[PDB]
Motif scaffolding. Structure first.
Motif, short mmCIF file in Angstrom:
data_model
loop_
_atom_site.label_atom_id
_atom_site.label_comp_id
_atom_site.label_asym_id
_atom_site.label_seq_id
_atom_site.Cartn_x
_atom_site.Cartn_y
_atom_site.Cartn_z
N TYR A 107 11.66 -0.97 31.20
CA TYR A 107 11.74 0.31 30.41
C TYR A 107 12.56 1.43 31.21
O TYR A 107 13.05 2.31 30.74
CB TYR A 107 10.13 0.88 30.57
N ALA A 108 12.88 0.81 32.56
CA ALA A 108 13.74 1.71 33.28
C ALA A 108 15.18 1.43 33.05
O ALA A 108 16.08 1.99 33.40
CB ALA A 108 13.39 1.21 34.70
N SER A 109 15.33 0.45 32.18
CA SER A 109 16.66 0.01 31.95
C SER A 109 17.56 0.69 30.80
O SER A 109 16.73 1.46 30.04
CB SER A 109 16.62 -1.71 31.56
N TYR A 136 15.80 0.38 26.86
CA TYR A 136 14.78 1.37 26.39
C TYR A 136 15.37 2.60 26.30
O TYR A 136 15.78 3.09 27.57
CB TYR A 136 13.54 1.54 27.46
K LIG Z 1 15.25 3.81 30.19
#
Ligand SMILES: [K+]
Ligand SMILES: [K+]
Lengths: 510, 510
Positions: A148-150, A153
């Motif tokens: 989700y940090a990437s 997302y």
């Molecule tokens: K993100």
């Protein structure tokens, strides 16, 4: 001061599509976009006719068909505007295919450390690999928060679309791109977890406060005025059924809501006695969710009540796989900041009740997915069990379960005793297809009559309702067996007790 | 009023053996009893000599060897007294072999509902079955609380054995049956979660209260008097290292303890400056555990401090498999009633600190096990990370992790850079053996020098200690690389900062 009108819906939109669980985590988005959403669009660009033709027979709804076929030009422009997105997401799809297909089968039981050396830049640092039970066959899981940090997302691919609601029934929404098809609609870029949506659903704003709000959503001119027009002047012990598998409850002033989905109101020609966004208390203390299927936890509903919610209870999973990714984390990206994950037969106290999580088998296509539970709620001496779609396919599990939990008064069981093929929901996440005749024996079904009987017979309830039935018209957003329901109503009544299938609404004594 | 003597140990015993995690859940007990503990006993009954001969070379400790070889007659009687137990447990072992070997491979991608029809009475109702990623290969999981509910988990096969402790080092305890080998010892039947043990470790009893206590454990005559003799008359901001990977902490009056294992005291000839059961504050507010390995969470230690503990934090797993069963539930059977399971990068506030759970890779033989985490603790502006045995085998994971968590001041990393074969611990749980040369490449290792370097280089700490080293003599209960530690001490110092390997004890400024 003003508030949102009861008859305006605010529809969730992710990457062009009606929004739900599996569109949130980039790794599942990507399997859907590639293996389903592009196929639906291209197929339509090529022959708008099939789709129209398809849309016209009611009985073909639910198939891979675009419902706004008139709007060919808009759809084409939208597809092409978003090509750099569909392309950065394919970069992930390829990484994952590459790891499942080229990298993992290379290894046969030895140390795996050589693999983190070869990971596609997309997955580098964002996966863990390991053998399964045979010790020789390699598998993996995503480190979900790093995903989700990437860059995959991306909150900016999220939106909401306001529109009026003029009747009970809903057109099937999952296969048709979310665009402004009419001047009554308003499509707006904002992240689904945004506190601006909270302002909206909360209301109580002055007219200048609405303009401010609307300027923070980057609106003006006619759009800002449409936005404004969606607002109107601001106007114990219960057990309320309210639709599909959604049930409300107050107990010594603590509120509960199970498997949330709600209808709207404020329009001529409704159905008398619906339980609506308008019928809701100030605060929802405890929100419970049995599983991860849209019929049980609809984004549209949830976004709307978010601001009134205390705690969300959900079943615990750590698989952190494609078919089955963490419910709890999904809820956190949607903006719910107090979420508790409950393991089988763990007990949480809730205001003046006790909530127990119960084992839940089937409804998931014999797939590896841990996000399912039923709930038992003890309100002092009365004690009610919500079983949702869970089927009794393991003979004694209910006897053993009863031995641990003690007696139960009331039971809600769901008898969608035949429903969809599991590939209908989960299909685009699989690695390759199964041979058709096999795929066919893998269904999402609720308990049928005999199974249901044996649940009742092993819990000895005095009251026994059947829900999760999919009757209410508004469920059409997202979606023989009655013979069986009725068999069960008689069985339970003949053995000296209350029974009843539910439809539309029902107050019940708690 | 009286209390337990600092120099008496109270040793955990399950089914005859020194007690630890995997002996608790009947399904893992059974794999150990059958595939390891019976083999050890029988092999000894046949030739006590091998064992003696083995026990005598120090370097052969840790192998499958009974350390009390003198006591042949007792051991034989014990084996035979417990045959009905070893036999009811084999009934489960067989069920499980039957399901993994006869039932599951029969199925090739179709519906599995036919299987709950065929389950051995032992497993009926107590398992869930499903396909893995390929959709064609069937697998399963236990419904853990129903297992503990079953006749196969039996509290009566549990015990404690009191004995004096006269020196620092400990003999290797895991392979030798727990019996009264001497009149100084006292073996007592009580369930490990019992509140009577809490009475004991709490103390402050009158002499008549001890007699009462001792009568509730069913003791009298000389046994009751031995019991009695184990009792003697009742007598800021810190960061304390205290042994192996165990670290204590006070911060604005909240207490923390990580990976608990403690030495004893009250005997001549100790080591100056140890941190002991006696050095502990009144209350342990927060107990943290990185993984499920005895060196990090020793039953003996835990039973002793149970009565002083607030919350236990542990890493979340739902695999509910043989190799990897739920840590949290184990802690609950041991009597810990406030246990919280934390997912990767979830954040819990704790008194005046914040605790973040961190991804943890390796140390588990590339096996499918989810119970591992490191912890980051933020005490306001200082922020310390405990990494335990976790190895940096994924290049960028630490960069990505840092991007989310911000800067870190202090780091503890464990550099058991080579240790045991993974089959040494996990071997009896596997389904069949691996071919020896393969099994050999599957180890439990800590980060070595280069890996460790890259952790430091990506977190930029000012302080950097290496622990989990297994130096302290008392670790011998349960268990080249220094070249590497030292390489790292110099690296970190040469780059302008504090570094140091730890041994025995250390106060540190917090
Ligand atoms: K993100
Ligand atoms: K039991």
């Amino acid at each position: 001061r003003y508030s949102l009108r009861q008859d305006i819906a605010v529809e969730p939109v992710i990457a062009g599509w009606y929004g739900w669980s599996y569109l949130l985590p980039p790794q599942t988005l990507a399997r859907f976009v590639h293996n389903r959403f592009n196929r639906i669009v291209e197929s339509y660009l090529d022959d708008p006719q099939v789709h129209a033709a398809a849309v016209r027979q009611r009985r073909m709804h639910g198939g891979p068909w675009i419902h706004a076929h008139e709007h060919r030009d808009a759809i084409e422009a939208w597809y092409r505007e978003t090509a750099p997105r569909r392309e950065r997401l394919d970069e992930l799809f390829e990484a994952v295919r590459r790891l499942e297909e080229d990298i993992l089968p290379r290894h046969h039981g030895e140390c795996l450390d050589p693999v983190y050396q070869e990971l596609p830049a997309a997955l580098a640092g964002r996966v863990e690999v390991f053998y399964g039970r045979d010790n020789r066959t390699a598998d993996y899981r995503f480190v979900e928060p790093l995903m989700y940090a990437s860059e995959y997302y991306d909150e900016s691919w999220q939106q909401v679309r306001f529109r009026p609601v003029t009747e009970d029934a809903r057109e099937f929404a999952l296969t048709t791109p979310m665009l402004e098809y009419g001047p009554e609609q308003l499509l707006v870029n904002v992240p689904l977890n945004s506190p601006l949506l909270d302002a909206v659903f909360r209301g109580g704003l002055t007219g200048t406060e609405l303009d401010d709000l609307a300027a923070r959503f980057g609106l003006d001119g006619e759009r800002a005025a449409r936005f404004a027009s969606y607002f109107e002047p601001t106007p114990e012990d219960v057990l309320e059924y309210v639709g599909h598998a959604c049930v409300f409850a107050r107990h010594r002033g603590t509120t509960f809501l199970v498997d949330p989905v709600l209808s709207y109101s404020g329009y001529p020609g409704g159905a008398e006695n619906r339980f609506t966004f308008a019928d809701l208390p100030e605060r929802i203390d405890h929100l419970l969710i049995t599983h991860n299927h849209q019929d049980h936890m609809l984004f549209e509903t949830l976004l709307r009540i978010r601001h009134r919610v205390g705690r969300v209870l959900v079943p615990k999973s750590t698989n952190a796989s494609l078919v089955d990714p963490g419910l709890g984390g999904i809820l956190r990206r949607l903006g719910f900041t107090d979420v508790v994950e409950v393991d089988d037969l763990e007990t949480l106290s809730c205001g003046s009740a006790e909530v127990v999580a119960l084992p839940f088998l089937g409804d998931h296509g014999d797939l590896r997915i841990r996000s399912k539970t039923g709930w038992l709620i003890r309100f002092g001496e009365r004690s009610v069990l919500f079983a949702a779609d869970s089927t009794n396919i393991s003979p004694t599990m209910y006897t053993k379960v009863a031995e641990v939990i003690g007696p139960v008064d009331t039971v809600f069981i769901g008898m969608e005793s035949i429903g969809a093929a599991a590939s209908w929901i989960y299909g685009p996440l699989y690695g390759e297809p199964l041979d058709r005749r096999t795929d066919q024996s893998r269904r999402l079904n609720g308990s049928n009559f005999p199974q249901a009987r044996e649940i009742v017979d092993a819990l000895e309830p005095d009251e026994v309702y059947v829900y999760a039935m999919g009757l209410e018209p508004w469920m059409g957003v997202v979606m023989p067996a009655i013979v069986d329901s009725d068999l069960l109503v008689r069985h339970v009544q003949d053995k000296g007790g209350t029974a009843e299938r539910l439809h539309l609404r029902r107050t019940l004594r708690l």
